[model samples]
Target chain A: QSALTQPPSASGSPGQSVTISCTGTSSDVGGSDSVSWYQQHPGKAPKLIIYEVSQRPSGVPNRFSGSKSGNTASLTVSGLQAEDDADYYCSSYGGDNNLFFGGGTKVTVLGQPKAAPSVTLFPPSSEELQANKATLVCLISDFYPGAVTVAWKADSSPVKAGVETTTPSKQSNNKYAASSYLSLTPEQWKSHRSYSCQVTHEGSTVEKTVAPTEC
Target chain B: QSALTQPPSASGSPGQSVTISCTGTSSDVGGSDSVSWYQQHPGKAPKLIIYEVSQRPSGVPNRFSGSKSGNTASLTVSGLQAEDDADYYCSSYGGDNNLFFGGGTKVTVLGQPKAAPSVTLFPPSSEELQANKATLVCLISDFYPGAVTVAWKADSSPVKAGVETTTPSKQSNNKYAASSYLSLTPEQWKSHRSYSCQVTHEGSTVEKTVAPTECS
Candidate 1:
């Protein structure tokens, strides 16, 4: 069962507050009282905030938070800073076999803090960007290891060549930490324009893609 | 905005059993009905184990769970593994900016795998330092007047007073926010003991404690 169900997009102007709601059923959210939230920005790993329904992870700003009622959970972003306009999601302890993520929300910049559009590979932000490869990195931390796969695609088509594997790190909970990194050449990325990371551990296949960061 | 009741503590043994209850007002858990449980090991961050009401966190073994009746929220752990020995808490949120927590419950393992413990010290590793400073945080959004206090205590003794606090900065959402930080030192942590952080906000109070930790 999918642990998450979220709206594809939500927008608000600068200074306007927005709420991204993550609703679950009795088996996921409604069933358990545990809920966590995360904020992710371009080219950065997800940041942990709004943990355990209002508790903030160390160093997280107070503007980001989580609250729950019944089966519905929410992440509220107040004093919307332009930087705060990134993607937000509510993740809960999904009971079956894995943690779940809600459909992410993107906050639109209403004024000076105008949010940048999604960047693409054709135009690199820097020469380093031309390192030019499309890769899929499956970043998962919860341990039931066997059920997922990481694949990459060139543009709209699938490309299997050029992949990197890093050794798995062990965690305190006795779970193996791992990620599969797959890369593609500039030509490959330029033509494909995007790459995807597909994970299938929870009986269902979920896919996340990376579009060019620049233009 | 207040909606729940719980005493300060609960204890149990390894392979023994324990349950933490969260009692709510008729408007929240009773009329609406939603409760969840979390297990937080000392020095480590909190994790969701039991949610919705009786559902366990993903990958969390079945030993942890939640249940409800009228206005009562219950979390029961069976075949209590030593690792299960820790601070357990229950919480539910709603219309108010405040999220409420049960006065934390501590789980202790009665049987020990060894005798008296000895202290070994060196400059210590980063991991050790991190372990020594158990960081637990509580945040309340839209808490007006910022008349909130987040207290950190050792064995019920106040070690630090009036720590980090801020009024809710108005967000685009137009809600006020506030936060606080506290730490528990490792020297003070005894196996099978408990520690807590209590907050007073919105004319109400709530507390969350640390659960016992087992050696690997």
Candidate 2:
């Protein structure tokens, strides 16, 4: 009835060990033998890491291991590497095809550290007025590891009605950058209180805001 | 990466319908298109009922339908029959071969009202002591729709090593009955605190226990 418990984030350095925990009850974890683990990188399909409690599927790295005791299941990453920095999830068979999963742990392999992205919000200019659309641009730049999420907010609340974002593109400076665009009716843009570009890079949130100027 | 949520149990009457829900997030359920459902009877391998969110494999019943909305999926069983009364499970393709599942729900169908079995546990007597084993018999009689589960207990805990149960056999009166046996070492039986036979028929549980009064 309830989801298995997991930490929101976990961290470790290169050549170190990282352990992600999934807690459940006897109704699923301790009572079932079908415990499994999965790994998902940003913007890509996920892969099965470990299954049947401790078995590594074919082609899976041997460093990943799974285990369970009583009411908790665990996914252990040995010798954390750069590629290991991704979301990890645990699942168990509640009865048969019925399974419950952990709420996913973002395992940050502290390899090479992380460079926070510089977020910038640009106000709608008159150039887009020819099309009767007010376009706002959120520019994210200078981020390392290139896995960042961006959100648009209108008047400081979340906004997603007319937003489109591109994948991280490599810059000439050897850093990564991404762009998000929010389109609004010309009148709505001039009327909204404020707009913000929120970028989450490496678990840190950086936000930039733009407001309509009044003469 | 959240587990899909489901009800613990669902029930309906015959000629009715039952819809089971599996709630999920965009990570595994809504974002992916690999939701599957399975049916499991007691002591048997689970059968794939629905796959790819709504596609049924061959030889499956047409009364079962699957559908998905924004963040929830459903498995609807129409004409709730006797065979549909089993544990229903939902699964999703997490990534590649990676899989996720919902906490299983027990679905019950009201069909062929049950007759609670009469249970009697007979203690070991001088009859079977020549073999140096203390054997007890649990006779379950006068039951309809004979799908029952039996468990043996010694000193209040479950004892499975020396217990054997039989399948239901039909009687002349059209009722069903079954038997279970528990064998113990004579010395162990004398020292054991108590012995019990627990029979679960439909939703009713009957327990019988006997003491070591008759001896060899």
Candidate 3:
């Protein structure tokens, strides 16, 4: 095993299917019981999409399938989404302790437009103030490419600490949602006349503000 | 959600098959995509045998198959060997970071009697002494339920340091093998009356020894 061979790139439109192939010698992919595939997005860890040649890992969406014939292995993505636009890697176990990894293939989701996030900021309730801190939550939903920058301000001044944002978690509607939290002390809660939450998606910044009276 | 139900023991003879079952509620096993199985040998870490209901992990023998129906999950071991005599555990994932584990099941391979190990000692070569030290190797093989205690001595004294023993690694012959090494300085190697390696398996001890003149 010198190496594995794969195309540099593969592409398909949204709701279509795309497959990437990895080919190797019989010493590896052809006769191996341990071929696997991975999906990786930008700035995130690689996820095991498939393992043991064709078995999908738990909790992974059923849209992805892996199969192999002879020395070639293929991973197919069906009903593709723009979120599927990422790098894919294939691997196989050789005799003894040898292993082979394919040259990564980049999958591009073409002709799909980007969607903006719907942002809403909710003020803390009376029961929630039992902790003696005001909890302000920013509900972010219906986003695409899930790339968003969130910031909080106490009346126009940036509040760096006490702000935490969640990574994108897939929603039932096929879009993405990433929520953020803003915690404030009771003293600072009333002193500041207004608190604001801002989310920047697709170069357009959507800002939401609330007052102490809103609580 | 209370707990999983499973038989405490499963038995099969060599070359036969045995299946173990795990039963749970709809919220745990029947409706979840995350059910898995584990195999644990004594004195060793547990191994993931199956995941995602019926999917086998890579390089696991095809004879071990997993399946599920309704609220029950099953793991079948075909062509059982004495090596298969170990504990098995089943687990399933519930809603949002919640998981449930079943009471473990112990498997037995019948008609398989424990076998004693065959111990062989290899002496150091001239090139092995290029660093002014001697290396002795002891290979113990063909054992069942490989529980072995190895002790090294030079001229009847114990060797506390410079001795390392490996865990059992399976061989192609369907038996287990565990190896040990003894390192000694050149002066201690030549002056010592003899170096001895003793292995205790199946309640019996087997000792092998070699003197300095045998270092050819």
Candidate 4:
């Protein structure tokens, strides 16, 4: 239970202001401030956006900001609108007591979202000629307790990462769910080729892209 | 921002097991477990009964319990509920600037009397610490938006707490000035000489003692 390294996606246009960084060490943010910050908006269930670290819990809205140095901790959300596009988490308090969340950073307000997912042209594919990539899969199940991030964009400006992983499932209300992965091929892959699969918790951002065919 | 030294009230009557204690320092709670506990209802505002300190912050309600030994931190509310009465706080993070609050503890549910005001414990001052230990201070500044709690017992048992710190001053109109730290350096104050900072809420029990008329 030690995860804190964010920045999988970010975009701003409507009255901008963005800052998301959560790096950990020294037994969780240098020992103590206890730090806490949360907010998840796609379906709901992650709202508290800062606690003990910077306060804010009464009505919340000073622009939603928090600061910390040493081991690293930050959360800034100035004017940006569009309901602030959800998914931003950074919680710390793990020496043995357990509690670590940080694998989210998505903030795309209105100027970004174009059928993302890319892989121009690769060099290995056993034998399925005619390159024109087509792989669109976006499933966000059980974003609970906190911790998760996966990003890939082709049309909305930001597509360089390719392999992602995580597995565990059970959702019919049974709770407990998690399954993530991303890949590419054609030269990379083409055919109306478009892809975008973004999901982060605490800083706000969720996307799904794929477009560009003919392989 | 100086307002911490709780216990506007406190109690124990339906089957009983009520123990809401909080005293600060070493910066705060001997420096970190990040002590946190809250449960308010007198006008409202102040929920989350427990956080980084003793856990329990997801749906909450295990009869509401929390613990910490060395620097003194406790919040026991087992099997007791009449709605659980009300007010109870103990926040931490007090290393440099501020973020401490314990001057709040109001819990009563026996025969019931929401009429308010009945808890007391503001007169325990006995000092004598050179090498072994002996310090007792349980003061309640007239009480208001300030909840309080101070417990240290020896002849009666219960006195292992080492440090609980707080220091914030400036009061008038806006209200809120604080001071709470129960330190015992001279060997648990010579093995506890009957000390107590027991000040429950607006319900009962408010005692402060140390016994030092001239131990010079």
Q: What class would a CAPRI assessor give candidate 1's docking?
A: incorrect
What level of docking quality does candidate 2 show?
A: incorrect
Q: Which should have the higher TM-score, number 1 or number 3?
A: 3
Scoring each candidate complex against the real one, what DockQ results? 0.03, 0.01, 0.01, 0.01
Cα deviation in Å at residue A199, candidate 1?
Answer: 26
TM-score attained by model 1? 0.33
Best by DockQ: 1
Could you tell me how far off, in angstroms, the CA of residue A154 lies in candidate 2 after the best superposition?
Answer: 2.3
User: Cα lDDT for residue B13, model 2?
Assistant: 92
Q: Write the per-residue lDDT of candidate 4 for residues B16-114, one digit (tens) a residue.
A: 778877877676776878888767544222356677667786668887888877666888998775667777777776664345666667777565333
Instruction: Give the per-residue lDDT of model 4 (tens digit) for A1-215.
Output: 22777675565667888888788988987678877876656332245558767877656789887888988888888888888877676778879776666766656664433222211111122122323332233434434323345566665656656543232223333332332333465545453245566766444566544444222
Model 1 lDDT at residue A185: 55
Q: Which stretches of candidate 2 lie over 4 Å from their true place?
A: A1-13, A19-35, A40-46, A52-62, A65-74, A82-113, B1-216
- The lDDT-based order of candidates, best leading, equals 3, 2, 4, 1
TM-score, structure 2 vs. true: 0.42
For model 1, residues A1-215, the per-residue Cα lDDT tens digits are: 23576554455666777777888877778777678776655333345567677787556777777888888888778777778756566777766655676755555445432221111111111222334433333343333331233454555566655543222333344443334444445565566556665544323455655555433
